[PDB]
Paper text:
Aiming to identify such rearrangements and following our hypothesis, we have conducted a thorough cryo-electron microscopy (cryo-EM) structural study of [name] ribosomes that were incubated for various time durations (i.e., 0, 30, and 50 min) at 37°C. Single-particle cryo-EM techniques were applied to identify ribosome flexible regions at 37°C. For that purpose, structures of the [name] large ribosomal subunit (SA50S) and of the whole ribosome (SA70S) were determined after incubation at physiological temperature for various time durations. The nominal resolutions of the SA50S subunit structures were 2.65, 2.48, and 2.73 Å for 0, 30, and 50 min incubation time, respectively (SA50S_0, SA50S_30, and SA50S_50), whereas those of the SA70S ribosomes were 3.11 and 2.86 Å for 30 and 50 min, respectively (SA70S_30, SA70S_50). Nevertheless, H68 was clearly visible; thus, this helix could be modeled in all five EM maps. In fact, while for SA70S_30, the heterogeneous three-dimensional refinement results in two identical classes with H68 in the original position, two distinct classes can be described for SA50S_30. One class accounts for 79% (144,826 particles) of the particles used for the three-dimensional refinement with H68 in the original position, and the other one accounts for 21% (38,658 particles) of the particles, with H68 already showing the rearranged conformation. After 50 min incubation, both 50S and 70S show two classes with rearranged conformation of H68. These data suggest that the rearrangement happens faster when the small ribosomal subunit is missing.
Numbering used by the authors:
A (entry chain C): 2 to 275
B (entry chain 2): 2 to 44
C (entry chain R): 2 to 90
Write the structure that this text describes.
RNA sequence: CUACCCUUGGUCAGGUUGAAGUUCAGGCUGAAUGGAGGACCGAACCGACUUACGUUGAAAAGUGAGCGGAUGAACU
RNA sequence: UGAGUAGCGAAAGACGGGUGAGAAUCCCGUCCACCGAUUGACUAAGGUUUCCAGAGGAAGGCUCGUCCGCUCUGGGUUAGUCGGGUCCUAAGCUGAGGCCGACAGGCGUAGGCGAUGGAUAACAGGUUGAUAUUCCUGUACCACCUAUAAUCGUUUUAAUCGAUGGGGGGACGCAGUAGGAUAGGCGAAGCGUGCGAUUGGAUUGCACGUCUAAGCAGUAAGGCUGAGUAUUGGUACUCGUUAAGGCUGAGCUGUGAUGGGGAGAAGACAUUGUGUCUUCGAGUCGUUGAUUUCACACUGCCGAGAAAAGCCUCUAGAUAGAAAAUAGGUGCCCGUACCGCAAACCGACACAGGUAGUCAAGAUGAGAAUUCUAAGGUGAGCGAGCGAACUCUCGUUAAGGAACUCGGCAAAAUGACCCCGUAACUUCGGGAGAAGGGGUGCUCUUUAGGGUUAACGCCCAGAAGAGCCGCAGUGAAUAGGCCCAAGCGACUGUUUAUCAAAAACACAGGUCUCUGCUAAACCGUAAGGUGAUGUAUAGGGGCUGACGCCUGCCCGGU
């Protein structure tokens, strides 16, 4: 799935890309596209508030439904497609009454396979059903946090979580990050893992390729002037010269925690990252 | 050598110009200040 | 309104060679359109108008003894007629 | 004016090299085909490395002769 | 005062005639010269009367001036179709109610405004001192209104129309390839021109061989494996790979528009002193090569490539009754002169600078390079002498050949095409145009492929011989010097506009750390935002900086 390039040029010397053998159709569906003009990290005042976001390739937005709330109707899979706005692939499904929509595509999904959502659906890759009805140990993706809002957890390429246990109206679950957390048992989730597992093996290869994706360069703090950054320079190269490395805004940046105290979700986190 | 001041009819009327000065409080200050001096051209 | 739309005739050499054809040149109020001009000529001179063209002229700069100013802006209309003729001198 | 960005448009004489893939032949390599690349040489265009001239200038930053890039992190 | 001193802003002019008080400098003529991928021709920005005619010469014009972008007087810009508005939306800007805020005010919903994009009906000729797809002539097209009418038949329905109703469409990247047409170029030449006084020739020198929109016919290839039935965009069936065109779109060609216009031509003027034109005549062929124009059509790739209206369809639903056709009518506002890679724009100047797009001829060539020319334009707003030193730009040089100098700085040398040959090293791609050698004109035979093509012939010769000339044959201009060995940085890229282009910054890759989503981080007093219409294979911060081999000891202090 990973194709390597021969070193015909110094720029292409160690570059890698993934062949798109999962894609079965190379043209999107006209009815589910919307415009997506770019913001280069600039807010409603017009000022730059996030660094390193710039001008990449133009993109259109595919309307994806993370809710999966059409229940009791079958949907047949048409094609797997490329999506520029996320790392996973997407699949276009057609409902029995003739409606179409996009879902994120799970790992072992095939064209022609039928897919279903509800409370009485079966435990098979692609199906969406409340966490109350999912047996312990299942691998699952696209999880909700508030019932009816839409999936929010485990949506990247190759992401998954698995169910662990049951309390009164909560369900234990382990996230890809490694933390264990309670989630309301009225919240939906979809069976399986997210596809495109090779996505993170790509070697980008040259500076221009990451500029095509909207990333502007990053200037290290130690090659700035004292009025620009706490690492603002001395004579020659210089060590850090402080008790701890700092950020461009003068706050410690190696080891210090920034999660805020007294959050309502404190009682739902059983075990944190390790 | 390229100089500053490349003229433009639309830019001039939109940055300076009566309606733009009237659209804010500090522009109305400018207009009143030029009226008090007796200036012949206001914007 | 008709005597107020038409102001005066224009007598030059271009206008005279046009009057060799059936075209007459007028200075008109600067607010009217060519349909009003067409209807005013027919009422005042009792003729049949075939067509009418119009153009605007800018104010010109002018001197009178270290006094810089501008002339009036003006609107000019040329009236072609089918039948009849306007008596002028 | 200048720096970065947003939306919508435009421009790049010619030559050279010959990647994936594909088709045969031999017994894995040879020939055809193909037309990749912040590839090569070089005008338009964009720059500003050396030098001569100019220094009450033709010009409050230029001119002459060479020079770097020239399908792209391009120029406009 | 310096002082009649410095300067008078890139360059080719000469002479005859004219006018005037006055002429190197104004007008006319001939010859000469310069540009010609442009010093030529169009359209934008910007300027705002600089445009044209008659008169003028105080000041402006780096000299002069009879002249003028200068002064005076009087003139000049014409649109249903060209570009905008009475159409559509992007970024952005505003925003009824609303949210927030010492005041001032900040944000935002529906909705508006806003082209640099989408939609959208006219062409040929004539004519002025100054405008022209606008005026005039000829021939068209597009909306709207009323009459004259076949079809119209409860107005459910039916013809009809029909939704802020549904569906389609508009609708889109980058590169490459093989074609079809056409524009334009070149050579024979079907009719026009004239035929030489310097030796010679006359089968010989030079040229033209055009023409619209609209309307009718057909049409070179292109795409859709097409075409029906039943049911709720989807599901079952039959003829299927036929593509027959079944359909859809499609460059272009022929007629007429046009026995018209214009026309190499005068040969017809009494005249418009014979100029110019009353007037009367005329040609529309075949060859060759051929786009950079007319499809993102087709193939491939990853970085995955606007919206809305105009438009086409099926409808709920509504109503006499609406169809094409003929005849008449009607059709607004703004811009329109002139300069425009510049004497009129931005540079205080009649300033060696800067300024978006379009058209793009011949010979030579791979070429829009090079040199000379075309169409067309221009001779540069101080001159005349003399040929001192010195300064600047340019050419040559005996013998030597880096001895010069901080340093081969500068200059010299290499350079195109064809044939032969090509090292260490290497990430196996490269290094490489490595280095190092040889060749090139003209004539005639023989061969002789592409065979241009019917064919040797069209044309490069595809090549071998035999000759001729010079000091020299890519005879001019234009076109890489190369090799060996060390630092530093992997590489392409970026930087101190105006003394530093680099070993500095980026970078692909590595690693540490924070972040479970109203995420962390960041802007803001807040509301509201970016992050992100993302969700740990994700996002923010710190350090290092391709690749290969690696990355030791110390947790006492902060």
């Amino acid at each position: 799935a990973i194709k390597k390039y021969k070193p015909i040029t110094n720029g292409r010397r160690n570059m890698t890309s993934l062949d798109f053998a999962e894609i079965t159709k190379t043209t999107p569906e006209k009815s589910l596209l919307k415009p997506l003009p770019k913001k280069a990290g600039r807010n409603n005042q017009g000022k730059l508030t996030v660094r390193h976001h710039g001008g990449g390739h133009k993109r259109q937005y595919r309307v994806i439904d993370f809710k999966r709330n059409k229940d009791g109707i079958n949907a047949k899979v048409d094609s797997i497609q490329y999506d520029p706005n996320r790392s996973a692939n997407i699949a276009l499904v057609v409902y029995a009454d003739g409606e179409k929509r996009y879902i994120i595509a799970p790992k072992g999904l095939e064209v022609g396979q039928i897919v279903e959502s509800g409370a009485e659906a079966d435990i098979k890759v692609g199906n969406a059903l409340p966490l109350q009805n999912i047996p312990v140990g299942t691998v699952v993706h696209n999880i909700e946090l508030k019932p009816g809002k839409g999936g929010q957890i485990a949506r990247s390429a190759g992401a998954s979580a698995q169910v662990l246990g049951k309390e009164g109206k909560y369900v234990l679950i382990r996230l890809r990050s490694g933390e264990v957390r309670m989630i309301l048992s009225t919240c939906r989730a979809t069976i399986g893992q997210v596809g495109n597992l090779q996505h993170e093996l790509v070697n980008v290869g040259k500076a221009g390729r990451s500029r095509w994706k909207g990333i502007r360069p990053t200037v290290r703090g130690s090659v700035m002037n004292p009025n620009d950054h706490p690492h603002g320079g001395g004579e020659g190269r210089a060590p850090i010269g402080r008790p701890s490395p700092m950020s461009p805004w003068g706050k410690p940046t190696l080891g210090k925690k920034t999660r805020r105290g007294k959050k309502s979700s404190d009682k739902l986190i059983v075990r944190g990252r390790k | 050598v390229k100089r500053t001041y490349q003229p433009n009819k639309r830019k001039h009327s939109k940055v300076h110009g009566f309606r733009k000065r009237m659209s804010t409080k500090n522009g109305r200050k400018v207009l009143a200040r030029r009226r008090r001096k007796g200036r012949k051209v206001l914007s | 309104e008709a005597r107020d739309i038409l102001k005066r005739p224009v007598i030059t050499e271009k206008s005279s060679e046009a009057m060799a054809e059936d075209k007459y040149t007028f200075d008109v109020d600067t607010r009217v359109n060519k349909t009003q001009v067409k209807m005013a000529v027919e009422e005042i001179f009792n003729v049949k108008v075939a067509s009418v063209n119009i153009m605007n002229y800018k104010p010109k700069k002018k001197r009178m003894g270290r006094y810089q100013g501008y002339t009036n802006k003006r609107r000019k209309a040329i009236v072609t007629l089918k039948e009849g003729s306007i008596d002028l001198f």
